[PDB]
Amino acid sequence: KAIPKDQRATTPYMTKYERARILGTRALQISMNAPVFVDLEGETDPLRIAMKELAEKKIPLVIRRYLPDGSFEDWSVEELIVD
């Protein structure tokens, strides 16, 4: 039932699955004409643009980590420490 921010006791590191689905969904949105928040260096492939947004944490998403008891947490990808 939405655990508050002071009680979030999950791993602050972004896993490979979270990075994978964030890059996949973000790249899918970029392929569907989504507003890009980072200036492009001449890229054409959507996955490279998604990784470019992840490298600067400009992806506007938040992860709803489901807990085994039915609860969940909201860890934004901007505050998640990548790698």
Partner 1 sequence: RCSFEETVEILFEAGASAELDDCRGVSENVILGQMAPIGTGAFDVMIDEESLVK
Partner 2 sequence: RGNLMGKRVDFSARTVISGDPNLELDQVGVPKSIAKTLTYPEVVTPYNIDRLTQLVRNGPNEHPGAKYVIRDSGDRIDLRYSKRAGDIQLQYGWKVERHIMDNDPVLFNRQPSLHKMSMMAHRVKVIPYSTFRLNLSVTSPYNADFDGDEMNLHVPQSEETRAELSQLCAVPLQIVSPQSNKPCMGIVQDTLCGIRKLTLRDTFIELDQVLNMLYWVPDWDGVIPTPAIIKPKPLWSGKQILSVAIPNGIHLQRFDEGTTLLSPKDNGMLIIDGQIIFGVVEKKTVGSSNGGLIHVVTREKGPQVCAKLFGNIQKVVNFWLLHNGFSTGIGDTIA
Among the listed residues 41, 44, 64, 68, the single contact to partner 2 using CB under 8 A = 44
Of 72, 8, 6, 82, the closest CA to residue 50 belongs to 82
SS (H, E, C) the chain: CCCCHHHCCCCCECCHHHHHHHHHHHHHHHHCCCCCCCCCCCCCCHHHHHHHHHHCCCCCCEEEEECCCCCEEEEECCCCECC
Stretch that binds partner 1, among 1-9, 42-50, 70-78 (CB under 8 A): 70-78
Q: What x-and-dash track marks residues 50-79 binding partner 2 by CB under 8 A? A: x-----------------------------
Among the listed residues 31, 66, 67, 82, the single contact to partner 2 using CB under 8 A = 31
Asked if 43 is part of the footprint of partner 1 (rule: CB under 8 A), the reply reads no
Chain positions contacting partner 2, by CB under 8 A: 16-17, 19-21, 23-25, 27-28, 31-33, 44-47, 50
